[PDB]
Structures are given as C-alpha cells and as structure tokens.
C-alpha cells in the first residue's frame, strides 16, 4: 500500500432508485466520498496511475537554499579586519522552503546540510591568490560566538566543524532531529514570558510568536589562510534537504507576501487576486 | 434520528433538535496521558467533573455590518471557575475541548456561518514598522474575544504604539486565503439547515503537556460566509459554549497574577 495502483473504476449501469449519492450536507463537515461510478454510467477500466510522487517524503526531496553568507580575505597592507561571518540557523528567511514547510503546523525531519562555495576577486589583479581553505564551525546555543578571525574559540574543542578546500565537491553533513520538543513548531501562538502585576513593564515583555530566541544554533565560517596581498571575496550558499520527514497538521498555504519572521503582512500589498468576470470562460 | 443530539458533560447537558452530526477533529477523541508518552514525573491532577462542564462565553451580536469574531482557547476560559483557577495554579496542563456554537434563526432568515478550529491561530499585528510586537494584554482578550476587520490600517503614532492585532477577514488574520480555511476542522451553520454546530477538539501540540498561560493551542474563528439578511439591519445572537474534556494538570505552584489592567 505504498506505490501500488489506485482503485479501479467499476462499471455502473443506469439506475432508478431511492439511493441518492448526489445529495450531501457540507454543514456536517464531511466531504461526500463519491466515485464517478456513483453518478455517471462508467465503463470498467484498470487504473495504472499511482500516488508515489505525491508522498510527503517525495514532496520534500528537493533541497532548497536558505542563506547566502559573505566572507573575505582582506589585503595585508589595509587596516580593516578580515570579515568572518556568523549566521543564526533558520529556514524563515527564504520564501520557497518557508512556504513549503508552512503547509503543516508541526514537523520532524532529519536535516542534510550542503555547502557550495564560490570565490571571486574584487580588485585590479596585482598578484593572484592560492587555493583557499574554509572552516565551517557549528556553534550550538550558549557556546561562545567568535569575536575575531583568530579567536581562541576556533580551536574546535567540542564544536563540530567542516574544513572545505576550494575546487572539491561541495561538503555535505547530516544532523538528526535536534529539536527539544517531540516535533518542530513552525507556528507558536504564545509568548516566552508572562507579564505579572508585581514585575515592572520593562522586565515582563516578550515577543509574540517567537517560541525561542536561539532555536538550532549558529554557523560560523572563516577563511583559514593568512592575509593575501590582494583581496579575495567569497560567498557560501547553504542548502537544506529534509530527510525522513513526518508532518502533522495541515494548513492553508500563505497567499500574501511575507514580512519578517512572524505571520504579519505589509501594507498595500494585500491584493492576491486579479480581475476577471463571473460569466467569462 | 440524526438531527437530534444530547451532549452530557459533568452537571451540564446540552440538547439540540436541529444538529448536524458532530465532528471529531482529526479522527481522535480526547484522552488522558498514556504512560508511554508522559514526560513529567509528578502525579497529575485529573479534576474531571469539576472542570469538564459547559461554560458559555459572551454572546456576540450578528448584524449586516458584522465581519466576524475569533477566540483563543484555553484563554477564553481563564475567568470560568475551577478550570480557570487550575490554569492559574498549575504550571503544566492539557485538555481537549468540545466547542458548541448556537445560532437560532427563523425559516425566513438566511445566512451562513463558518465555524473553524485552527491549531496555533497566530494573527498579524497592526505595526507595519515592527513585527511581532503585540502585547500579552491585547493578544489574550479573554471571553469577549476579538473582531476581524475588513481593511488594514496601521497605527501611525510610533510615540505610543497600540500593539494590537489587525486581522483582515478574507486573509483569515494570518495571510492565508479564506477559501482554503476549510482544510481545518470545521462545520457550517446554515440557517436553513442547522441551528448549531459541534466540534470535539483533541489536544494537539508538539509537546505532551504545555504551559496553558503562555501558549494557546486552538483558535476558534466564526466568519460569516453568506451575510445575514431578512425582510426589513436585523440582529441575531450567537452563543459559544466550550467544555474541557480529559483535563489534566501538573506542577502545582503559587498563583500567577497576569497583568491585564
């Protein structure tokens, strides 16, 4: 009962009877489970079509981009520090994966990261650059975020880390279901703190909708190499591919354009439909 | 027959002569915590008859100009008796709900209400300049609920923000189109067909038990699909009655006093 054929349409003759499949009551909330043999004179037909491609695991098989993060390796003579970059891990900033995940309220999925790295020069050439090495460190919540490119926390005492050499195949790593609850909550109709009559207003306040302020931890990427004589800048694209996904409560898909992490909508853009006519095919 | 129905919960009983068959949302009747799923180790309080009874909220008035109404559970029951007191005294709790909506009209009236049960019914804020800014005082309005509005209007005065919801009706308050809201557990009160609707809602959450004061599990939205009109604006009342089912509380502590002035 996984990839097997859909049920065959039985042959039906003309009818004149008290049985009335055509009439229903949507007020009951049930949907009238009719087949075409109930109201029209169908022939017999063995059906070969399946439903394999519409499964949940098939639906989320495609990987999606979530972040485009920038690092550089500044020219040695210039004053400015080397830009390492630091990203709060979330799916809610790219519209496609957010819209697909927001079809359902609660989900569990294993999570397969994939990192694609592309580099480019930014100056009149003045000396080439060797093949750079990139360190991608996973920083779980509460761990010390780096302050400098050569900070002590890059020493990788307990954090997981990936070292990627340019020109190789894109690096891939899998993380299990890391959520503290029994499922992820895409929506949270609540607050982190309750304001109380004893506490001051400044202490009791909380964001609406935000279940937690650091859900899944932090990624940090740096260029391992020293200051090259000429500037090289690179961008890292992170791709999310859910595995073993189970989803639990269906929802209407988002119609209006997104705005921020919450379910809020921007002024003016609240017009999803377009003009047509009731009596025009 | 099937149009007649009697619901008995605790000392309360509801008898209706023109009911549709009741909806058990997501095919699951409410149940207590199984031993294989219980996370806390302290002994749970199961108050049963002291909380599993029908409480009636405020009665809204339906007019030609009315756009719709919404409520949050268990927030709307926070003033209702021993269930509200147990909510305020315990850290963790869970319950199912039987939601019963009564709206009676003559055979000469016409109109249709959609009663929608929404898990995690988040709503959009007024502030186009600051997301997620709605305060706890405005987000949890209690028994009187809140009203959908036909058009969006942000507060211009950033010097003293309103910090309230601005739910657009056809966008279902969350940016999803109204015609797709029927994927939620629902029943339609059509005034020619049935005078009441009954939804039995199981406890659905990502956790086995949760802090009821912080988190609202279900939302109930009543939206007029077809407007009420009658040969003349007419006004007919809608009464909403909720009874907890299989309520279970854990973690007794001192009473919380939420700031709601």
């Amino acid at each position, epitope marked *: 009962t996984s990839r097997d054929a859909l049920p065959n349409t039985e042959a039906s003759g003309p009818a004149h009877s008290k049985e009335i499949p055509a009439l229903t009551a949507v007020e009951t909330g049930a949907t009238n489970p009719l087949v075409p043999s109930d109201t029209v004179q169908t022939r017999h037909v063995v059906q070969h079509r399946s439903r394999s491609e519409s499964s949940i695991e098939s639906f989320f098989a495609r990987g999606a981009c*979530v*972040a*485009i*993060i*920038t690092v550089d390796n500044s020219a040695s003579t210039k*004053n*400015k*520090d080397k*830009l*390492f*970059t*630091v*990203w*709060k891990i*979330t799916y809610k*900033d*790219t519209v496609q994966l957010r819209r697909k995940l927001e079809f359902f309220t609660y989900s569990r999925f294993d999570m397969e990261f994939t990192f694609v790295v592309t580099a480019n020069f930014t100056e009149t050439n003045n000396g080439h650059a060797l093949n750079q090495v990139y360190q991608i460190m996973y920083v779980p919540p509460g761990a010390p*975020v*780096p*302050e*400098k490119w050569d900070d002590y926390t890059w020493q990788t005492s307990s954090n997981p880390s990936i070292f990627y050499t340019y020109g190789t195949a894109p690096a891939r790593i899998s993380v299990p279901y890391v959520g503290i609850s029994n499922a992820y909550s895409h929506f949270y109709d609540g607050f982190s703190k309750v304001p109380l009559k004893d506490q001051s207003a*400044a202490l009791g*306040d*909380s*964001l609406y909708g*935000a279940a937690s*302020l650091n859900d899944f931890g932090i990624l940090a990427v740096r260029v391992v190499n020293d200051h090259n004589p000429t500037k090289v800048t690179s961008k890292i694209r992170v791709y999310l591919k859910p595995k073993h996904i189970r989803v639990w409560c269906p929802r209407p898909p988002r119609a209006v354009a997104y*705005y*921020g992490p919450g379910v809020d909508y921007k002024d003016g853009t609240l017009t999803p439909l377009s003009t047509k006519d009731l009596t025009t095919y | 027959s099937d149009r007649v129905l009697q619901l008995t919960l605790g000392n309360s009983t509801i008898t209706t002569q023109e009911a549709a068959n009741s909806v058990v949302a997501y095919g699951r009747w409410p149940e207590y915590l199984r031993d294989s799923e219980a996370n806390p180790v302290d002994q749970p309080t199961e108050p049963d008859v002291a909380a599993c009874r029908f409480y009636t909220l405020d009665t809204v008035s339906w007019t030609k100009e009315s756009r719709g109404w919404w409520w949050k559970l268990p927030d709307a029951l926070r003033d209702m008796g021993l269930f509200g007191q147990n909510m305020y005294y315990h850290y963790l709790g869970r319950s199912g709900y039987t939601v019963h909506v009564q709206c009676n009209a003559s055979k000469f009236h016409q109109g249709a209400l959609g009663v929608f049960a929404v898990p995690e019914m988040c709503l959009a804020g007024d502030s186009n*300049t*600051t*997301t*997620m*800014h709605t305060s706890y005082q405005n987000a949890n309005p209690g028994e009187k609920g809140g009203t959908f509005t036909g058009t969006f209007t942000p507060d211009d005065n*950033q*010097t003293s923000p309103a910090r309230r919801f601005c739910p657009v009706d056809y966008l279902f308050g969350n940016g999803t189109l109204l015609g797709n809201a029927f994927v939620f557990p629902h029943q339609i009160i059509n005034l020619r067909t049935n005078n009441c609707a009954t939804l039995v809602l199981p406890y659905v959450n990502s956790l086995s038990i949760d802090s009821m004061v912080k988190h609202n599990n279900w939302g109930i939205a009543i939206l007029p699909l077809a407007p009420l009109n009658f040969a003349s604006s007419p006004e007919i009342p809608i009464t909403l009655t909720i009874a907890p089912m299989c309520c279970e509380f854990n973690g007794l502590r001192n009473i919380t006093l939420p700031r709601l002035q």
Partner: antibody
Amino acid sequence: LVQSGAELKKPGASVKFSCQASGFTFTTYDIHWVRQAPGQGLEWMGMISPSRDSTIYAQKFQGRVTMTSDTSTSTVYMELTSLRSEDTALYYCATASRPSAWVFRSLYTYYYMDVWGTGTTVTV
Amino acid sequence: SALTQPASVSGSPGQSITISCTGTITDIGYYNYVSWYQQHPGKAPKLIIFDVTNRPSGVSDRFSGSKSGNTASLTISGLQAEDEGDYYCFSHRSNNIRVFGGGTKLTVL
C-alpha cells in the same frame, strides 16, 4: 574622507544639505545622516543607498525630509522642507563601511557607521 | 523611543566602571547589532565596540562589553583621564529603523 557642505541660518523656510564622498565608498556603501542638537545626543535621520537609490526615513523626520543622489559628482543631497526652532542643530553625514559578522536577514551584510564628516551647524 | 542610559557616571582613575544601555524587547533583546560610540567634546564620534563584544583596531583593551536580556553594558576597567567624554549606545529596531541612546557623560575625578 568625506566633505560636508555649507552652514546656513535662514528661519522657517527650507534648507538644503550637501555631502560629497569618494567614488568607491559612494558606489559600494550606504550613507547615513545624524542630527546632533547641543547636549541632546545623537538622533538618526535616514539612509541613502546610491548602489540602489533606495531611501529610508525616520518616523520623526518623514513629513519634512527628502534625500537625493548625484552619481556624476559622487554626492548626495538632503533637503529639510520645513524647519522649526528646535531644528537648530549640528548635522552629520556618515558613511557606513564597518561590516558586522552577523548575517542580516539571511542574504545581506550589516554595516555600522565608521567614517564621519566634519558636519554643518544650521540655525533657524 | 530612544534607548535608556544613565545621565552621568563619576569615578576616580584606576577604577573599573560600567555604563549600561537598556532597551525594549526589540533592539538589544533580539538583534545582536548593538554598538557603542565615543565622542570627545567638539570632536566627531568614533566607534569603540562594533559587534556586542568586539573591538576595532586602535581601541585599547580596557574597554569591554556584554549583553544580558534587554540590556547591554559597556565596562571600562582601569579608567584613565583620556577616557572622559560622551558615550552613546546604538542598535537596530526590528524592521529597518535605527535608534540611538540618550548618552552618558563620564567624569574622571
């Protein structure tokens, strides 16, 4: 180095501001305006982004302040359309070029203001 | 509107002294784009701490910063006479609005 405009004194009527910068900083980075009244502390006025010509104005300033750019001279301009006596202040033009490590949204980088002009006192 | 700061802080040289910036649930409490600025009298402002705990070059190590909840604090350990001047908090409102602090005057006794 960023060059600020002249200092003006006429009351009530509109006053125009000028801010000239080097081409690399003009094309690559955003430009901010900050007002400094005597002893009152810094107050943010708005942002010009000549890489895309988008502008954002503060809510205290939106009814009075307009901003424009000139790519030929690598110069941006700000005009206060109406001025109260409160508006008598020192005004600063600043270019943001210090990048934050934290990724803004998931697709952009954040720049703090780090290069400041000489500024202009304006009297009403 | 503006971020809250104490009006004035005073102390002798050699002390360890902190100046605190308290905002709403937005600004410091959600966005880590919290920065501090310094202004000697008559001078243009100069950045001292750009990310929450990170110093630019040319700023001495006696300046330090920290974040806790809706509040971020700038701590100067071993206060010196040249540090006397204005100090300004700066952060980001939740959707593309920038907000300064009220400022603090530090007097070295």
